[PDB]
Design a protein around this ligand. Structure first.
Ligand SMILES: CC(C)[C@H](C)[C@@H](O)[C@H](O)[C@@H](C)[C@H]1CC[C@H]2[C@@H]3COC(=O)[C@H]4C[C@H](O)[C@H](O)C[C@]4(C)[C@H]3CC[C@]12C
Ligand SMILES: Nc1ncnc2c1ncn2[C@@H]1O[C@H](COP(=O)(O)OP(=O)(O)OP(=O)(O)O)[C@@H](O)[C@H]1O
Ligand SMILES: Nc1ncnc2c1ncn2[C@@H]1O[C@H](COP(=O)(O)OP(=O)(O)OP(=O)(O)O)[C@@H](O)[C@H]1O
Length: 1186
């Protein structure tokens, strides 16, 4: 909360012009609809009280039908200057704010991102705070002068027209506005209890799409639809009451509005027959208070955005001003002439200023000679990037002088000092630009010639030519998503252009494949010529090429020697322990880097309006009562325009005895047809939600029941991942609710007006009811634009500014890399030119949408001055009179307003969603493997378990390049063991994926008991085969269910004995709730070793003859692994087993051990066989490894 009138601090001379015009021109538009009614009261009062002198009919009406065109045409230059000088004065005060919010955050030291505000929010606050400030300069101030103009002019064309009918009307507007306040709140209670329950029943599909490999493995793909049904039966009983609370919520408006014109239109009839008030002045005074009375009601939402503005701007002015203390522009600095790379650190102690007690650096002493290959290889977790983060002078040391040619870092100029030092971190940084721009961030003023040879030295120039756009390829969201080595070599070239004198490299090839890390070292050795070089490395090749090696120890330099002297010490020194931490990062890198790859016209609406509304036919008895209630509220929207009209004819009758009677009908009917509005308005909106929701639940339970029939190969395809399936069941399920439900209640009750409004037109006077019906399109159009107003034109500016935000998103997040260069003037000048095409676009939407509301409020107030011109032309030529003509006119205009307050009450159909394409694509995709196929040979009794593979070839449809299996055959015998091993990670699990029929082999037969797996019912053949997954994640339920999720039915004693045989029952007996303990992702997270025990407890319940054990290791307990295997000795009692593991002691007693090699078996035998008959193979060497 800064204040008001400090938001406008970026203002200049010209923005004090666009707010003068945006205020006065928004004041003329406010004082119009009051000063239109008094040209309407004075018209009818003169048109209707001269029924004997026809000469004072022409020059009276034609005078006031030229005060409508002026009131018309003065809403060109008062609504093409309000809407088009605030939405352009909120683009010269927000856009100049986002520039200074990036000139004063990237120009701020790193410690500001540590002890002040997080880096998670300063990337957030440029997106969410710099929009809700912009909505309080432009729109919600322009919609606030406009109301106080209507409000004050609501009470001066009011209280001086008629005294005593203004005081009564002002005692009514409370009774309306306090009921419209009940209507807006009690919906918002259910609007946040309903969708919260949908987020409860929205992750129940997320606990199946993520774990699809276990759900489709077992039979239970139906029983995880049985929860998603019953978790939405809650979401109807929070949806049925939404209609019944909106049904009475409109009913208590049409009860008060009718029963407050039973008074104001009686008390008007008391005034005329005591000679105080005419007939124009008693319908004008009645409206001009009920215009200005309710126009104060929308002055609160424009006020509420002046509360969130002044506080969400206060988070931005914290960073704008914010004096630093480190001397970046230190023009009282010194300069050198010839550096040599002489770097020394003496008695340096340093830790972070976030935990000011640690001793990360403790008397650090490094001596770097000029032009060497010195390497800092110490223990992990001992800094090992903070040491790099001081030679750059990110921070400042607590105590100790950092020497550079015998000079301190607190002497030179940082703008000049950072130019000599090149730097490559572990992960590089490339911004959403082209290629040459991401190269010129090192040095600005190089030509094209110096760039092209340098990237060729870095071995990047080859595939840049292979790119289609060359060096103008837009790297970022587009740019065909270059690989990590390709991202690496550009940043290597980004330092080569700079020509540094000192080199700093921290884990260059730590995340690169064996192909490109050779290619990097081909470029590094070219770049390490004659330069002072400090490399923290990852492999021995740099260590062998290292000149001098220093060894850290707990924040202290321990060993200072060479590559050979530290190697000659043997295991006496720490250099042998450096090997112990070396290849721990070698093999775990590209195994896990593989895991990143292994884990990854009107005929369009022809039947989609009809096939959709054909499965919506067990409920026709609830949509032929809500159509009855849509006609009755169709009449009462137009019957009210008749009573208000025909009273206005009674006021000009000189018989004060027909006037007491013929008011006393139109007051008693107005109460008698007020009680039959509230009763028949909770049938129009209540029964069009019981037809509403019971379609929507019937669609959500067919989509998930038809996603789970697609093959496993369908499910990892490009768009079918986890976060994109729940979107197709959240957007497509709710956007299809508003297509059959709303647009029968709207299309009918905007026809029940026309049979009652135009009937009064084509009975009383058949000639006036053509000209009004010909101009009847432009009236109902012009009321929609008065209702698209008050929500503001040009909404949702996230889409117009999502491209420019991405450059500020990556720049703040890379604040060490950006400040490692002097690239803090280009990220300013490139944040500019991502705004200049979305700045001119917001301009020309001002000059178009300003006039598109400008004309359509002139064609309304002109078509009133042509309707009421054809009134006096009939009276002058004796074809009609006053009583029939003004009874026609006000019916056809007040009903015309009542039409347009239907289209903006049930919105979102006029291409509100074309999502009907996305639904029927998903319900009607055809599979190739039917998971429950009728007419198939059944499963026999409890079989011997003959697993056998014959001449099998495989290829994933995601990557059909590499063939996995090349004429592979393998046979499990009648129930002993077929334990398999192999090299190169747990990708070997793609043998189990062939048995489960998750995929299809390229050639061969998958025969079981001499019978193919295409000759069984697929759920029936997935009955007898258990499977332990690799990394078990669990369901957000009880442990008692996750073990009961292993059979069709479940009994108590079967769960208890099996978990005891699983040997997890002990600590389960020591848990707080034990079996009924709530686990998953919403409660107690467990250990990975106990996650293994639950998964093994799952598989034992199946009593499966065939069993497929994946990696049962990484249960870090030598006691438990032996004891579980003792039970696993009994877990194969007459059972066929494939056991796939790592440690050879598990397969020590295995019958048939085989090795995967090049799509073929390598060796066949066991422990006593392959060490006897083929002792020179792979099976003997890995025993010495373990
Ligand atoms: C026949 C026309 C010449 C007419 C006078 C016209 O100028 C005027 O703009 C009409 C369309 C408006 C002006 C005031 C409006 C009313 C504003 O005050 C009312 O009585 C409110 C009460 C309540 O808010 C209703 O939902 C709308 C309702 C009932 C409006 C119905 C239509 C109007 C009567
Ligand atoms: N503000 C901070 N920024 C970074 N590290 C911090 C900070 N405060 C404390 N630290 C500690 O500094 C340590 C630096 O990490 P570590 O010593 O494991 O090597 P590293 O810097 O991560 O090496 P690399 O970046 O090459 O992986 C962290 O373990 C962290 O606990
Ligand atoms: N879930 C998956 N979907 C599609 N393709 C995959 C999947 N997992 C892995 N792959 C592909 O298979 C390749 C290697 O995984 P695979 O399962 O073939 O291991 P493997 O060759 O059997 O390993 P091993 O050396 O242990 O025999 C990867 O390059 C990857 O592209």
């Amino acid at each position: 909360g800064v204040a008001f009138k400090e938001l406008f601090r970026f203002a200049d001379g010209l923005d004090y012009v666009l707010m003068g015009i945006g205020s006065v021109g928004a004041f003329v538009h406010g004082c119009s609809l009051p000063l239109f009614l008094r040209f309407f009261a004075d018209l009818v009062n003169s048109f209707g009280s001269n029924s004997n002198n026809v000469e004072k009919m022409m020059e009276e009406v034609l005078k006031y039908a030229l005060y409508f065109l002026v009131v018309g045409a003065a809403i060109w230059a008062s609504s093409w200057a309000e809407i088009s000088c605030w939405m352009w004065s909120g683009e010269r005060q927000t856009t100049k704010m986002r520039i200074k919010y990036l000139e004063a955050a990237l120009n701020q030291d790193i410690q500001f991102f540590d002890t002040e505000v997080r880096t998670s929010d300063v990337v957030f606050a440029i997106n969410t705070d710099a929009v809700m400030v912009q909505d309080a300069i432009s729109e919600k101030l322009g919609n606030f002068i406009h109301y106080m103009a209507t409000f004050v002019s609501g009470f001066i064309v009011g209280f001086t027209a008629v005294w005593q009918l203004a005081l009564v009307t002002l005692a009514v507007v409370p009774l309306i506005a306090v009921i419209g306040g009940i209507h807006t709140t009690t919906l918002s209670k259910l609007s946040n209890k309903s969708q919260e329950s949908l987020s409860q029943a929205g992750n129940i599909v997320e606990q199946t799409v993520v774990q699809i490999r276990v759900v489709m493995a077992f039979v239970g793909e139906s029983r995880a639809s049985q929860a998603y049904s019953s978790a939405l039966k809650i979401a109807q009983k929070l949806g049925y009451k939404t209609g019944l609370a909106k049904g009475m919520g409109l009913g208590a408006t049409y009860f008060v509005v009718f029963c407050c014109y039973a008074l104001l239109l009686w008390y008007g009839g008391y005034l005329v027959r005591h000679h105080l008030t005419n007939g124009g002045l008693a319908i004008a005074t009645m409206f001009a208070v009920m215009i200005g009375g309710l126009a104060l009601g929308q002055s609160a939402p424009s006020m509420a955005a002046f509360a969130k503005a002044k506080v969400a701007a206060a988070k931005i002015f914290r960073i704008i001003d914010h004096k630093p203390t480190i001397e970046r522009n230190s023009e009282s600095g010194v300069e050198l002439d010839s550096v040599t790379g002489l770097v020394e650190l003496k008695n340096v102690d340093f830790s972070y200023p976030s935990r000011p007690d640690v001793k990360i650096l403790n008397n650090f002493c490094l001596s770097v000679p000029a032009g060497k290959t010195i390497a800092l290889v110490g223990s992990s977790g001992s800094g090992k990037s903070t040491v790099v983060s001081l030679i750059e002078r990110f921070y400042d040391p607590n105590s100790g002088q950092v020497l550079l040619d015998g000079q301190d870092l607190k002497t030179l100029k940082l703008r000049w000092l950072r130019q000599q030092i090149g730097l490559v971190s572990q992960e590089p940084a490339l911004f959403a630009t082209s290629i040459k721009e991401n190269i010129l961030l090192g040095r600005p003023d190089a030509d094209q010639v110096e760039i092209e040879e340098a990237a060729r030295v870095a071995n990047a120039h080859s595939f840049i030519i292979k790119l289609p756009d060359g060096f103008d390829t837009q790297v970022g969201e587009r740019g065909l998503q270059l690989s990590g080595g390709q991202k690496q070599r550009i940043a290597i070239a980004r330092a080569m252009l700079k020509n540094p004198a000192i080199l700093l490299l921290d884990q260059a090839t730590s995340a690169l494949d064996s192909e490109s890390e050779k290619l990097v070292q081909e470029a590094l050795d070219r770049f390490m010529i004659g330069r002072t070089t400090l490399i923290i490395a990852h492999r021995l090749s740099t260590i062998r090429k290292a000149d001098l090696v220093a060894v850290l120890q707990q924040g202290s330099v321990s060993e200072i020697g060479t590559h050979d002297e530290l190697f000659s010490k043997g295991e006496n020194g720490v250099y042998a322990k450096l090997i112990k931490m070396q290849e721990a990062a070698h093999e775990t890198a590209m195994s896990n880097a593989r895991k990143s790859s292994a884990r990854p016209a009107f005929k369009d609406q022809a039947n989609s309006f009809w096939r959709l509304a054909k499965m919506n036919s067990p409920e026709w008895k609830y949509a032929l009562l809500g159509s009855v209630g849509s006609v009755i509220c169709g009449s009462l929207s137009a019957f009210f325009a008749y009573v208000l009209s025909a009273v206005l004819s009674v006021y000009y009758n000189p018989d004060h005895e027909y006037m007491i009677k013929q008011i006393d009908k139109y007051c008693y009917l107005l109460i008698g047809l007020s009680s039959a509005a509230l009763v028949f308005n909770t049938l129009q909106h209540s029964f069009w939600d019981i037809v509403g929701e019971n379609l929507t639940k019937r669609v959500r339970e067919k989509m998930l029941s038809a996603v789970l029939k697609n093959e496993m190969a369908w499910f990892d395809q490009e768009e079918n991942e986890s976060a994109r399936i729940a979107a197709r069941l959240a957007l497509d399920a709710n956007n299809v609710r508003s297509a059959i439900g709303d647009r029968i209640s709207v299309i009918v009750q905007n026809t029940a007006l026309m049979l009652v409004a135009c009937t009064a037109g084509f009975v009383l006077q058949w000639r006036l009811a053509l000209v009004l019906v010909a101009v009847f399109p432009v009236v109902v159009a012009a009321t929609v634009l008065q209702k698209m107003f008050m929500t503001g034109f040009s909404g949702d500016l996230e889409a117009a500014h999502a491209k420019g935000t991405q450059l500020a998103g990556e720049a703040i997040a890379n604040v060490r890399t950006v400040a490692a260069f002097n690239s803090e003037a280009k990220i300013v000048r490139l944040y500019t030119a991502n705004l200049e095409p979305p700045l001119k676009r917001c301009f020309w939407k001002g000059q178009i949408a300003g006039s598109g509301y400008g004309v359509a409020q002139f064609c309304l107030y002109a078509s009133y001055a042509l309707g009421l011109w054809y009134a006096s032309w009939l009276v002058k030529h004796g074809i009609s009179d006053f009583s029939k003509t003004i009874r026609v006119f006000m019916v056809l205009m007040v009903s015309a307003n009542g039409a347009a307050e239907t289209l903006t009450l049930a919105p979102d159909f006029i291409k509100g969603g074309q999502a009907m394409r996305s639904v029927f694509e998903l319900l009607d995709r055809k599979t190739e493997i039917e998971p429950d196929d009728p007419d198939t040979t059944p499963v026999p009794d409890r079989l011997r378990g003959e697993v056998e593979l014959k001449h099998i070839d495989f290829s994933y449809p995601s990557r059909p390049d590499i063939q996995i299996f090349r004429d592979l055959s393998l046979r499990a015998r009648a129930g002993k063991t077929l334990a398999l091993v192999g090299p190169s990670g747990c990708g070997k699990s793609s043998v189990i994926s062939l048995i489960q029929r998750f995929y299809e082999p390229s050639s061969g037969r998958v025969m079981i008991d001499g019978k193919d797996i295409r000759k069984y019912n697929l759920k029936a053949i997935r009955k007898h085969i258990a499977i332990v997954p690799q990394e078990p994640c669990l369901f957000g339920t009880t442990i008692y269910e996750n073990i009961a999720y292993g059979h069709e039915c479940a009994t108590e004693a079967e769960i208890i004995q099996a978990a005891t045989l699983a040997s997890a029952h002990k600590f389960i007996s020591a848990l707080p709730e034990g079996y009924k303990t709530y686990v998953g992702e919403r409660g107690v997270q467990l250990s990975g070793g106990q996650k293994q025990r639950i998964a093994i407890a799952r598989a034992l319940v199946r009593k499966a003859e065939i069993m497929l054990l994946d990696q049962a290791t990484s249960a870090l307990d030598a006691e438990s692994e032996r004891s579980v295997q003792e039970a696993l000795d009994q877990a194969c009692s007459g059972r066929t087993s494939i056991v796939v593991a790592h440690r050879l002691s598990t397969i020590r007693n295995a019958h048939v051990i085989a090795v995967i090699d090049d799509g073929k078996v390598a060796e066949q035998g066991s422990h006593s066989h392959l060490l006897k008959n083929h002792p020179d193979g792979i099976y003997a060497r890995m025993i010495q490894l373990q």
